[PDB]
């Protein structure tokens, strides 16, 4: 089993709408949800960080505490499971800065994930999004060996991404379409 | 004439608010809607949840946190300056007796006649799961025409969520 990030309806849409708003600037925000299995990360919600490029310095500790404090008053009390950021027109990949930013997220929680969206490429009719973690310290699968090596090469690897919707969201989605 | 355009994200957020607060049979959730009222068609593109309690036995008793509106709205402005506070939402299923009074309070946060969207989170229903209202003297609620609109980015999102 592959490690998989399950993205909720509202998390996907809020990331797409924020990233598209920020174009041509890179934007970022935090991801809320839970870690489950070794192989499961659930992203239930996200929220935007104000603009200031994207780095640890863009993470506004007071904005974040105040957001989490208010969210908790309205029944949203999930921990931060990582962060997302757009890059408009470049693929989904981490630069050296993103890796440092992720290192810092990882220090807090070894399981944190980095989500990268490209909102410009998404309007081709396909959502371009991926998730990543860093990789720290007879029968095989050839393709997975090939990915552990390209991963080792660049210091991070990608996770599978899936979308979760409840049966009531599905019904609502089908009337919004 | 007067039309309302609603982004999909808005209806999914109200449903996620209703469900995450374990909102009881007969009870409701309430929040704020943001967008652009500066045209003949009011565009609703965002929302946030409010702490709200009312008395099941006594429709004239209810509490809405005023500090939370100002404090959340000031955080929304830091993300999107053009996304104004334009009205409010509740999960219904129908208009309540206190709604005109509540609507009055929201006048102090909007620069338009506040829009009330009633979101059907019970799915008991054949099409668009939100009805829009505006208070007028002609005081009473006027039902408005409403339709779905979101920017290209969200529309691809929705299709990806169904196809996936």
């Amino acid at each position: 089993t592959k490690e998989t990030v399950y993205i909720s309806s509202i998390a996907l849409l809020k990331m797409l709408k924020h990233g598209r708003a920020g174009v041509p600037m890179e934007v970022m925000g935090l991801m809320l949800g839970e870690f489950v299995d070794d192989y499961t990360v659930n992203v239930v919600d996200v929220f935007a960080m104000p603009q200031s490029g994207v780095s640890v310095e863009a993470v506004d500790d007071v904005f974040q505490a105040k957001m989490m404090d208010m969210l908790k008053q309205t029944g949203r009390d999930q921990m931060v499971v990582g962060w997302y950021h757009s890059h408009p027109g470049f693929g989904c990949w981490l630069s050296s800065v993103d890796v440092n930013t992720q290192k810092s997220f990882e220090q807090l929680n070894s399981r944190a994930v980095a989500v990268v969206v490209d909102p410009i490429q998404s309007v081709k009719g396909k959502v371009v999004i991926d998730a990543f973690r860093l990789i720290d310290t007879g029968l095989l699968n050839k393709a997975n060996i090939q990915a552990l090596i390209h991963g080792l090469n660049r210091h991070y690897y990608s996770l599978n991404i899936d979308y979760h919707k409840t049966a009531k969201e599905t019904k609502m989605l089908m009337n919004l379409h | 004439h007067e039309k309302v355009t609603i982004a999909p994200l808005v209806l999914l957020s109200a449903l996620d608010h209703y469900e995450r607060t374990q909102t009881k049979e007969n009870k409701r959730c309430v929040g704020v809607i943001l967008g652009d009222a500066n045209s003949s068609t009011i565009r609703v593109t965002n929302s946030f949840a409010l702490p709200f309690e009312e008395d099941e036995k006594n429709s004239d008793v209810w509490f809405l946190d005023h500090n939370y509106i100002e404090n959340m709205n000031e955080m929304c402005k830091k993300i999107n300056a053009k996304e104004k506070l334009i009205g409010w939402y509740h999960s219904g299923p129908k208009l309540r007796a206190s709604d005109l009074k509540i609507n009055e309070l929201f006048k102090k946060y909007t620069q338009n006649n506040p829009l009330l969207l009633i979101v059907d989170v019970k799915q008991q229903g054949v099409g668009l799961p939100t009805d829009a209202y505006v208070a007028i003297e002609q005081k009473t609620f006027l039902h408005l025409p409403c339709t779905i609109e979101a920017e290209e980015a969200e529309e691809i999102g929705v299709e990806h969520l169904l196809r996936g």
Partner: nanobody, 121 residues
């Protein structure tokens, strides 16, 4: 109603019970099943969860080493084997289905009516 739990009742402290849940599967799909429990005056609390296929499981801290969740795929049944029961384990127990692999109750799609478990004090 699509799910229907059984097993459960009164048992002394230190005792054992096996809960079961049958899914008719005539309205709702599910790739995940879970147990939850609700004590009088308390929030519904996640107990355990399992995927129909593969059968990967995950448990609440207070229940690890004592409770086992398992499933009979072909018979569409989930089981909770509860060993070393304590008074604090007393609650109505609910099986729940949906597509979400995790602990949040409002991510689940449908519920049984519940079965009462009472562990003598």
């Amino acid at each position: 109603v699509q799910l229907q739990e059984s097993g459960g009742g009164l048992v002394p402290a230190g005792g054992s019970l096996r809960l079961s849940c049958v899914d008719s599967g005539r309205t709702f799909s599910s790739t995940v099943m879970a147990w939850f429990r609700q004590a009088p005056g308390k929030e519904r609390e996640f107990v355990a969860t399992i995927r129909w296929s593969g059968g990967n499981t995950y448990y609440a801290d207070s229940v690890k080493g004592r409770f086992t969740i398992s499933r009979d795929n072909a018979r569409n049944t989930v089981y909770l084997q509860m060993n070393s029961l304590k008074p604090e384990d007393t609650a109505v127990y609910y099986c729940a289905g949906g597509t979400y692999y995790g602990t949040l109750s409002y991510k689940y799609d449908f519920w049984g009516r519940g079965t009462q478990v009472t562990v003598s004090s």
